[PDB]
Design an enzyme around this catalytic site. Structure first.
Site, PDB file in Angstrom:
ATOM      1  N   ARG A   1      69.010  -8.759  24.210  1.00 53.06           N
ATOM      2  CA  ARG A   1      68.280  -8.009  23.711  1.00 53.06           C
ATOM      3  C   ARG A   1      67.759  -6.653  24.290  1.00 53.06           C
ATOM      4  O   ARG A   1      68.031  -5.878  23.825  1.00 53.06           O
ATOM      5  CB  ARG A   1      66.573  -8.506  22.659  1.00 53.06           C
ATOM      6  CG  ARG A   1      65.548  -7.846  21.969  1.00 53.06           C
ATOM      7  CD  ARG A   1      65.053  -8.731  21.410  1.00 53.06           C
ATOM      8  NE  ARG A   1      64.178  -7.989  20.544  1.00 53.06           N
ATOM      9  CZ  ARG A   1      64.384  -7.027  19.500  1.00 53.06           C
ATOM     10  NH1 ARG A   1      65.384  -5.928  19.119  1.00 53.06           N
ATOM     11  NH2 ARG A   1      63.180  -6.623  19.156  1.00 53.06           N
ATOM     12  N   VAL A   2      66.652  -7.202  25.810  1.00 59.17           N
ATOM     13  CA  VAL A   2      66.400  -5.174  25.961  1.00 59.17           C
ATOM     14  C   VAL A   2      67.235  -4.609  26.731  1.00 59.17           C
ATOM     15  O   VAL A   2      66.979  -3.458  27.534  1.00 59.17           O
ATOM     16  CB  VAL A   2      65.100  -5.732  26.683  1.00 59.17           C
ATOM     17  CG1 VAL A   2      63.935  -6.127  26.167  1.00 59.17           C
ATOM     18  CG2 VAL A   2      64.827  -6.795  28.069  1.00 59.17           C
TER      19      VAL A   2
END
Lengths: 116, 269, 59, 115, 86, 86
Positions: free
Chosen positions: F34-35
């Site tokens: 995700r990041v």
């Protein structure tokens, strides 16, 4: 362990490692301890680790172990097989089909495996 | 819900897997029956070809219209491992040559899945037969073959072909198109006139080639059905293996839950 | 017949102008297509690719 | 989801989509064992529309842009009903199944099919 | 030769006594020693050597081997052999 | 399922890919970060986008490849590129 300390390489044969797990379940129930998943003792992984961690190669000598394994209900995910397979380094599978052809030993070269 | 519904699904799929394993051998048995029928019809076709060859070479007095410049075979039943699809896919390849050439097309159909194909795209059917047994008889083909022969004599067709699968091997059915109508030391003692003889023999020759194409397509069908039932047996085995993993999860959960309700009940008493 | 060979090529049914024509006329009647169409059928690839993938995904 | 709240056109479109998806879910085990080619001429047409409906339900979001790169889409209720009603009626039976995946409104499925 | 027509009913009777004595339960509510119950019984069925018979009978019986053969019976539920007592 | 509800993405290692000789057996189909999209350097970020799609194009054709040599040039080039990226 005494033979290992004489500077030797030793073989330790265990007739059935599943019966060692069951004896621990029976003792845990007799002592009144609260049961774990699938009804096994809460100490299942520690009782297996205390036995299996002594079987090693040291600076003096070594103990190699051949252990017969029983799989409950043919389920490889059951807590007893699952806890035991974390300690095994090799798997030798004996085949009824290979024995029928007259070949001995009846090892299955395709199903048997080793981490080595 | 739990272990009971999964156990019922496994038993249902297990029953089906046993028959698909058996039907694979039933299809191999029928494949061998079709292969012996393919060989039994060859002596007749080759001798008719030998007679017409000499009877045309030796008699330069007459040239039959068939010596100067599609019939589609398909199955009537399910379990075909791409047999009909590979054939229809290939028909378009030769038809594309006719579209570049600007030529018109007439179609004849043998079998229910072939009739269902052209009916689903607007294809012009000039003749059609269906529901034939796994061991067909040549007298049923006479009708469909004659309409296609008449269209040639009426000048409506320039060339005619038979579209069918060929038996390359027990694991391979090849889609094909074969031209039907457009094909030295002694002479024969003709009792009737030679035109009547050549005209009669050429009709028997084309009918025999269409029948051989139909019998070889049936051998290809039983071979395709063997592969399809083999694959169904293998596919069901993967589904049973996965359902066994889901069942084991429910077995462990049921034992753990019962003990957790039992220990709680004994702690209260 | 030839000096060293005798071949008899028999027929399965009794041919005649009526039976031979009747089977052809019955095959025109059997070509029961309410709407004849054109034969262009440009959807060939759209159907052939769908069935080619479906027949592959089964194995 | 009541005719007295959303009107009959929306209600029937939603009920039509659920009927097609339910019938496709019943055929899953047969399709896995025997393949799509053994189904009836009616079931084959319904499965083809079910696959298109299932893909047209997808939508690129304005918060999901970081994950893939695609720009987000906002689709009105009017455009939503029109797209699914057309797929149920058969107005898009000729377009390819991948043209409905990640396209917002129904007109964009027509432009995606040109590639 | 000995026949135990239902070892599963003996296990049920021992489970009843154990729960009424308030002993800790395990799987299927059986006590921690239900394996030992049947094992202590079934390991008596055996064949003994001539030396055992000669020692037991104080030499009254010589050159003969004695035996006890067992045919225990157990009832399964819908063919489930993975149950605890079975 | 509890740890997936805490972490910022997962690398899934597949048994089938590992037993097939693909030793770094990362399952691209379900592995996600995700990041991490904001964390890559400019050179790896620009060249990686073209490579994830190639593996997605291969995922659907890999099993059927032995009899896929007769398809259209687009399908054949996507499969050939997918085998090379794999």
């Amino acid at each position: 362990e005494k033979f290992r300390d004489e500077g030797r390489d030793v073989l330790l044969f265990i007739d059935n490692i599943y019966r060692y797990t069951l004896a621990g379940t029976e003792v845990s129930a007799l002592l009144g301890r609260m049961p774990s998943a699938v009804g096994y003792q809460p100490t299942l992984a520690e009782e297996m680790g205390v036995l299996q961690e002594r079987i090693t190669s040291t600076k003096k000598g070594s103990i190699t172990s051949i252990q017969a394994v029983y799989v409950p209900a043919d389920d490889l995910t059951d807590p007893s097989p699952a806890t035991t397979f974390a300690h095994l380094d090799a798997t030798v599978v004996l085949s009824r089909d290979i024995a029928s052809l007259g070949i001995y030993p009846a090892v299955d070269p395709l199903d048997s495996t080793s981490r080595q | 819900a739990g272990a009971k519904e999964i156990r019922s699904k496994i038993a249902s799929i297990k029953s089906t897997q046993k028959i698909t394993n058996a039907m694979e051998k039933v299809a191999v048995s029928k494949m061998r029956k079709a292969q012996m029928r393919m060989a039994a019809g060859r002596p007749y076709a080759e001798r008719i070809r030998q007679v017409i060859g000499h009877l045309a070479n030796a008699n330069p007095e007459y040239r039959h219209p068939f010596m100067v410049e599609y019939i589609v075979v398909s199955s009537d039943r399910g379990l075909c491992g791409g047999l009909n699809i590979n054939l229809f896919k290939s028909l378009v390849k030769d038809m594309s040559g006719y579209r570049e050439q600007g030529a018109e097309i007439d179609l004849c159909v043998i079998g229910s899945k072939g009739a269902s194909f052209f009916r689903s795209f607007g294809g012009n059917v000039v003749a059609a037969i269906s529901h034939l047994g796994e061991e067909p008889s040549i007298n049923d083909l006479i009708g469909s073959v004659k309409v296609m022969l008449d269209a040639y004599l009426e000048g409506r067709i320039d060339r005619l072909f038979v579209v069918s699968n060929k038996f390359v091997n027990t694991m391979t059915q090849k889609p094909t198109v074969e031209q039907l109508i457009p094909l030295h030391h002694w002479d024969y003692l003709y009792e009737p006139d030679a035109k009547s003889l050549l005209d009669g023999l050429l009709v028997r020759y084309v009918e025999s080639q269409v029948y051989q194409a139909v019998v070889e397509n049936n051998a290809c069908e039983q071979a395709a059905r063997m592969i399809a039932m083999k694959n169904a047996t293998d596919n069901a085995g993967e589904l049973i293996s996965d359902l066994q993993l889901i069942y084991n999860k429910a077995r462990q959960a049921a034992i753990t839950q019962e003990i957790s309700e039992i220990v709680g009940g004994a702690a209260a008493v | 017949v030839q000096p060293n060979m005798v071949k008899v090529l028999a027929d399965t049914v009794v041919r005649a102008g009526d039976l031979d024509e009747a089977a052809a006329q019955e095959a025109l009647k059997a070509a029961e297509k309410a709407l004849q169409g054109k034969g262009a059928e440009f959807d060939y690839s759209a159907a052939a690719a769908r069935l080619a993938e479906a027949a592959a995904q089964l194995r | 989801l009541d005719p007295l709240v959303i009107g009959q056109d929306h209600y029937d479109t939603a009920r039509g989509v659920q009927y097609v998806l339910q019938r496709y879910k019943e055929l899953k085990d047969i399709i896995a064992i025997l393949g799509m080619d053994e189904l009836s001429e009616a079931d084959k047409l319904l499965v083809a529309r079910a696959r298109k409906i299932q893909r047209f339900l997808s939508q690129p979001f304005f918060v999901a842009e970081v994950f893939t790169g695609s720009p987000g889409k906002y689709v009105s209720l009017k455009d939503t009903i029109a797209g699914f009603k057309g797929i149920l009626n058969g107005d898009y039976d000729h377009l390819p199944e991948q043209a409905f995946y990640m396209v917002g409104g129904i007109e964009e499925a027509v432009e995606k099919a040109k590639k | 030769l000995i026949v135990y027509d239902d070892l599963s009913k003996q296990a049920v009777a021992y489970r009843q006594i154990s729960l009424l004595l308030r002993r800790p339960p395990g799987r299927e509510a059986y006590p921690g020693d239900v394996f030992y119950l049947h094992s202590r019984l079934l390991e008596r069925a055996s064949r003994v050597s001539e030396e055992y018979v000669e020692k037991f009978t104080n030499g009254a019986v010589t050159g003969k081997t004695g035996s006890l053969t067992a045919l225990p019976i157990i009832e399964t539920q819908a063919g489930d052999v993975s149950a605890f007592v079975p | 399922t509890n740890v997936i509800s805490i972490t910022d993405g997962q690398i899934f290692l597949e048994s089938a890919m590992f037993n097939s000789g693909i030793r770094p057996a990362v399952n691209a189909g379900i592995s996600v970060s995700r990041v991490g999209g904001a964390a890559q350097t400019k050179i790896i970020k620009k060249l990686s986008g073209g490579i994830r799609t190639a593996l997605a194009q291969y995922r659907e054709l890999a099993a059927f490849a032995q009899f896929a040599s007769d398809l259209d040039e687009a399908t054949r080039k996507q499969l050939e590129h997918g085998q090379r990226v794999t």
